[PDB]
Amino acid sequence: PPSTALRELIEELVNITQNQKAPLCNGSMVWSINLTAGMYCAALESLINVSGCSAIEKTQRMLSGFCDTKIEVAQFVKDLLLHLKKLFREGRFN
Amino acid sequence: VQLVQSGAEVKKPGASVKVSCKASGYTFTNYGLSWVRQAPGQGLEWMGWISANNGDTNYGQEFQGRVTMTTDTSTSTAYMELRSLRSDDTAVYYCARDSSSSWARWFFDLWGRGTLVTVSSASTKGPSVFPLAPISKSTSGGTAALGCLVKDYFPEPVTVSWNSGALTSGVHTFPAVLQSSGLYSLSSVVTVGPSQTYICNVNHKPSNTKVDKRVESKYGPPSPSSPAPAKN
Amino acid sequence: YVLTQPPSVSVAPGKTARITCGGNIIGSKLVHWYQQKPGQAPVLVIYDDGDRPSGIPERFSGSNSGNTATLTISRVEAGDEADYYCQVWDTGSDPVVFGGGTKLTVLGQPKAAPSVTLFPPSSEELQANKATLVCLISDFYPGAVTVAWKADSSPVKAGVETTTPSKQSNNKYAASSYLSLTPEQWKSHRSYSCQVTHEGSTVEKTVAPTEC
């Protein structure tokens, strides 16, 4: 099914932002991006700059399959999660 | 921007109901409609969805076979027909605006006001009116509750007054219950001081019934040495 | 796909109410919330996890993470008393799923235990070859009860109808419950009981056919 890649990406974003898990990347900060569809490249470019972590490693691979101010990785992933769910609903799987 | 639903319906078991939902203030054919029912005091249940664009449908699993959804573009109206009705289909049926997408279901921003469908085998029937009086003798320092049981009537509503409307304080008239038989029952109770005559007046217009029922206590004002129960 | 809500939440005026909606990876879905008052259609209060439609107070907010979505209502008012339903779309067998609903009670007065009167069948009804027990329940707060009927210590679940609690003139609640019996059933048992559970505490009343 062609919605599998996005479904799995969404599901990974959820897994790594569970309340139980520690604050993502120890509160490292990344460039915020404009979430407007076809933003997978830009999202990868923000995340690939976070060295180590490992918690976002799977998200980084997942974004690869798709490809002026800073915010916490936690907030970045949560805002991206919400956006992708809306894309999923509208049938944008690419 | 509104959804306008048809009026309340009374149906026999095994009959069919067709409920209508008219859209106003938006482009009808750019959206869909979901139908959602609610049996009295219970939760929301999704029945299905129709696209106003092409008339594609997707029915709830519990309703597949029993429901048909249609649209009439000329009048911006959608129809939901439920067949082979049972007592347990007694519910308020709502229409709500949804996306025209056959892929994803969305939030329901706009709702109709709902159409009550009551499913009953009953014909019009006047009530039997019975007195409610405590089993135990009245006691000082307590209130006494007297009532009338308005039993086995159809359809709603019944009007209950006490002493031709002169008694109004300490009166409580309960909502009706719909029994398994398909008939309604209702109670009205007056709370009073142990001891004046009490008459409940029952009005059921559908059956042209007007009843006056005098209700007396079993044992009168408090009498500690009357051979009568105290504890039930 | 299954959504799970607590059946009830109670909150004092001015406090913050939180209503949960549990589902497996519900965080991966867009969650919507509806407020429904009795006699009225549901109203959309939160959509897409945490957005408010125009005309909904900023006191309403929504969160969705992991296996739990939450509707939060700050500075609760009596006008917030309602049933609340969460809703998702799912790609499986049920395309639209509603939660079971949560009743939000806003505790506007002190707790009051109910007063119970159990009426036996009237002589008139018995002459008409029928029997009905009426359990009258009054002066209680908050307006939620469970009614159980017993005959000679055995539970009776068939032929039972109970009304949803209605407000009285004194601002407390009242309810009624009915047990439909035949005259031979009535006369064949030593006693019948109406048992009313209110806020974890039971009030029981009993009638005896030989006396009643």
Contact B95, B20 (CB under 8 A): no
What the block records as the tokens of B232 is 């039930």
d(CA B27, CA B77) in angstroms, rounded, equals: 12
d(CA A28, CA A77) in angstroms, rounded, equals: 12
Comparing alpha-carbon positions, the chain C residue that sits nearest to B37 is C41
Q: Where are any strands of DSSP class E within chain B?
A: 2-5, 9-11, 17-24, 31-38, 45-51, 57-59, 67-72, 77-82, 91-99, 115-119, 128-132, 144-153, 159-162, 171-173, 177-178, 184-192, 199-204, 209-214
What the block records as the tokens of B37 is 């029912």
Residues of C in contact with B41 (CB under 8 A): 164
User: Tokens 């029993």 belong to which residue?
Assistant: B66
Comparing alpha-carbon positions, the chain A residue that sits nearest to B101 is A90
> Considering only residues 104 to 143 of chain C, which have any Cβ-Cβ distance to chain B shorter than 8 Å?
117-122, 124-125, 128, 132, 134, 136, 138
Comparing alpha-carbon positions, the chain B residue that sits nearest to C54 is B109
- Tell me the CATH number of domain B1-121, given options 2.60.40.10, 3.30.70.260, 3.20.20.70, 3.40.50.300: 2.60.40.10
Tally of CA atoms within 13 A in the half-sphere of B33 that contains its CB: 33
Taking residue A61's Cβ as centre, other Cβ atoms within 10 Å add up to 12
Comparing alpha-carbon positions, the chain C residue that sits nearest to A16 is C66
Q: Is C74 exposed, middle or buried (0-12, 13-18, 19+ CB in 10 A)?
A: middle
Comparing C-alpha atoms, which of B140, B116, B137 is closest to residue B6? B116
Contact B37, B90 (CB under 8 A): no
Alpha-helix runs per DSSP H in B117-167: none
User: Tokens 């086995």 belong to which residue?
Assistant: B152
Domain ranges of chain B: 1-121, 122-232
- Quick check: B135 and C32 CB within 8 A? no
d(CA C122, CA B135) in angstroms, rounded, equals: 10
d(CA C16, CA C189) in angstroms, rounded, equals: 50
Q: Is B179 on the interface with C (CB under 8 A)?
A: yes
Residues of C in contact with A18 (CB under 8 A): 27, 65-66
> Considering only residues 149 to 168 of chain B, which have any Cβ-Cβ distance to chain C shorter than 8 Å?
149, 151
Strand pairing report for B115-119 and B91-99: antiparallel
Contact C191, C197 (CB under 8 A): no
Cross-chain CB nearest to A14 (options C28, C89, C91): C28
The kind and range of the H/E element at C96 are: strand C96-98
Q: Is A54 on the interface with C (CB under 8 A)?
A: no
Domain B122-232: give its CATH superfamily: Immunoglobulins (2.60.40.10)
d(CA C29, CA A88) in angstroms, rounded, equals: 10
Residue C47 is classified by DSSP as: B
Cross-chain CB nearest to A17 (options C65, C89, C91): C65
> Considering only residues 22 to 61 of chain C, which have any Cβ-Cβ distance to chain A shorter than 8 Å?
25, 27-30, 48-49
Who contacts C155 (Cβ-Cβ below 8 Å, separation ≥6)? Answer: C148, C149
Comparing alpha-carbon positions, the chain B residue that sits nearest to A3 is B103
Say which experimental method was used: X-ray
Indicate if B122-232 has the same CATH topology as B1-121: yes
Q: Is B107 on the interface with A (CB under 8 A)?
A: no
- Tell me the CATH number of domain A1-94, given options 1.20.1250.10, 3.30.390.50, 3.40.640.10, 1.10.10.60: 1.20.1250.10
Q: Is A53 exposed, middle or buried (0-12, 13-18, 19+ CB in 10 A)?
A: middle
Domain ranges of chain A: 1-94
Q: Is C89 exposed, middle or buried (0-12, 13-18, 19+ CB in 10 A)?
A: buried
- In chain C, what are the domains? 1-108 (2.60.40.10), 109-212 (2.60.40.10)
